[PDB]
């Protein structure tokens, strides 16, 4: 039960307007045959062009929505739209390109997928709401065969060139003309009522429907992300390393210990309310405070209402007003004034952050986390946390060449005393680097307005 049997049934109702007379009884095997591909009973890593929901979900980084509209069937021109916002017109003879033959259109398809996917995935998954023309158009830009490797590296082959008769991955495909061994999934097999627009629009107000093909392609991927990562969530599925995942996760642990340690030293809160991941550990384990945990899973859909987190049914809610609240990636509509907050900025551009549903983003770093749209109004009671480095650690080298550090934000005994020691300068530069890493990954840090780093200097006396 790993791969999708070619002898599985494919519901054909969706296809019968572009393909009138299509049999109600249809297998992937006969559909793939109809699309013009020969699978020559082959056991070489590519048993099916089509894949399971489960397989699509392991490969969410490879998803490209794809839609074709009959512009006025070998007879007529076709509008090719992709979730990248690109529209190509192919003649048989927002970005919108004039009519060209398949032999140039196919080169543009390879360039576009390569530049989109080379830092994301080892493959492409075309996400369809299939009506027929997208499926019969694939023969014009796709070739299949046994799994292969790039002619320049060890990565699996995703492209093919007729000019050179060679195979490339997404990194090495410049001037290649065919997509090689693509995958695909028809969202219309998932058992929806009514059309794409009506299903999409239930969940998402951000993607309009200008009635161009890219609009449908974007909506199709959006609906699919909603179904696989918002309504349903599976946090067991791991995802490969493709960038700075480890450095970023380490940075977030370092910034969290630093900021909460400094807050406790500066304002000496008697109680900390730690709201969010039910597996969360004390980020400052030596600190004096009453540490009280509150369980909330990552909200995939809408930010939590603070009122709902405090709603206690027939018992009294704990008083939040006492001490400080820590929301470390726990996304609520409006934070209380006495909060420390880490909140992921869905708008950030990175290889980890994929476009999501209704203005949210799918952040994929070991696990996949759909995050509700970033909203500045959530922080009305807070201010941005300023950068600072704090250490009570002794001034002591042990065992990196030097320019001496001067900074107002290096809060150590040595800087109090007039000259930063080498140990604290090394630690300061490492911590500035981790902080910059975390910010540029898309985390934003907010704090109660009374927070003042001036209060930290008298913890050395
Ligand atoms: C900061 C903070 C977060 C959460 C709560 N919530 C409760 O105390 C509570 C008690 C019983 C059932 C329940 F669902 C919630 C209070 C807080 O002060
Ligand atoms: Zn390669
Ligand atoms: Zn949408
Ligand atoms: Zn020092």
UniProtKB/Swiss-Prot annotation:
Residue ranges of the region described as GpppA-binding: 357-371
UniProt: Zn(2+) 14 binding residues: 150, 153, 169, 172
Residue numbers binding Mg(2+) 2: 69, 211, 216
Regulation: Inhibited by Remdesivir antiviral drug (GS-5734).
Catalytic activity: a 5'-end (5'-triphosphoguanosine)-ribonucleoside in mRNA + S-adenosyl-L-methionine = a 5'-end (N(7)-methyl 5'-triphosphoguanosine)-ribonucleoside in mRNA + S-adenosyl-L-homocysteine
Residues that, per the record, bind Zn(2+) 16: 395, 414, 421, 424
Active site residues per record: 67, 69, 134, 211, 216
Subcellular location, record wording: Host cytoplasm; Host endoplasmic reticulum
ExoN domain: residues covered: 49-230
Annotated residues for binding of S-adenosyl-L-methionine: 274-280
Top-rank lineage group of the source organism: Viruses
Domain N7-MTase: 239-461
Record's function text: Plays a role in viral RNA synthesis through two distinct activities. The N7-guanine methyltransferase activity plays a role in the formation of the cap structure GpppA-RNA. The proofreading exoribonuclease reduces the sensitivity of the virus to RNA mutagens during replication. This activity acts on both ssRNA and dsRNA in a 3'-5' direction.
Protein name: Guanine-N7 methyltransferase nsp14
Species lineage: Viruses, Riboviria, Orthornavirae, Pisuviricota, Pisoniviricetes
Covered residues, full protein: 5949 to 6449 of 7096
């Amino acid at each position: 039960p790993t791969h999708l049997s070619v002898d599985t049934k494919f519901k054909t109702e969706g296809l019968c307007v572009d393909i009138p007379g299509i049999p109600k009884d249809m297998t992937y095997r006969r559909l793939i045959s109809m699309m013009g591909f020969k699978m020559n009973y082959q056991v070489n890593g590519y048993p099916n062009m089509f894949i399971t929901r489960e397989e699509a979900i392991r490969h969410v980084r490879a998803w490209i929505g794809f839609d074709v509209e009959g512009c006025h069937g070998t007879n007529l021109p076709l509008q090719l739209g992709f979730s990248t916002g690109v529209n190509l017109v192919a003649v048989p003879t927002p970005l919108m390109y004039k009519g060209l033959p398949w032999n140039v259109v196919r080169i543009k398809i390879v360039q576009m997928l390569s530049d989109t996917l080379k830092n994301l995935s080892d493959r492409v998954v075309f996400v369809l709401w299939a009506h027929g023309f997208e499926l019969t158009s694939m023969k014009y830009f796709v070739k299949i065969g046994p799994e292969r490797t790039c002619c320049l590296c060890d990565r699996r082959a995703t492209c093919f060139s007729t000019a050179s008769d060679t195979y490339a991955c997404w990194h090495h495909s410049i001037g290649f003309d065919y997509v090689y061994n693509p995958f695909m999934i028809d969202v219309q097999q998932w058992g929806f009522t009514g059309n794409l627009q009506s299903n999409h629009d239930l969940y998402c107000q951000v993607h309009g429907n200008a009635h161009v093909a890219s609009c449908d392609a974007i909506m199709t991927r959006c609906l699919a992300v909603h179904e696989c990562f918002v309504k349903r969530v599976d946090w067991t599925i791991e995802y490969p390393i493709i960038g700075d995942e480890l450095k970023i996760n380490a940075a977030c642990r370092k910034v969290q210990h630093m900021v909460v340690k400094a807050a406790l030293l500066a304002d000496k809160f008697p109680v900390l309310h730690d709201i969010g991941n039910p597996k969360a550990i004390k980020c400052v384990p030596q600190a004096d405070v009453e540490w009280k945990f509150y369980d909330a899973q990552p909200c995939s859909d809408k930010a939590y209402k603070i009122e709902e987190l405090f709603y206690s049914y027939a018992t009294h809610s704990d008083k939040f007003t006492d001490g400080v609240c820590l929301f470390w990636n726990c996304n609520v509509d409006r934070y209380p004034a006495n909060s420390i907050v880490c909140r992921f900025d869905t708008r950030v551009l990175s290889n980890l952050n994929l476009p999501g549903c209704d203005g949210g983003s799918l952040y994929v770093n070991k696990h996949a986390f759909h995050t509700p749209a970033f909203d500045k109004s959530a922080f009305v009671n807070l201010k941005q946390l300023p950068f600072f480095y704090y250490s009570d650690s002794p001034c002591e080298s042990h065992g990196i060449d030097y320019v001496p550090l001067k900074s107002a934000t290096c809060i150590t005994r040595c800087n109090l005393g007039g000259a930063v020691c080498r140990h604290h300068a090394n630690e300061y530069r490492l911590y500035l680097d981790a902080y910059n890493m975390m910010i540029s990954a898309g985390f934003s840090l907010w704090v109660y307005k009374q927070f003042d780093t001036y209060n930290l200097w008298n913890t050395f006396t």
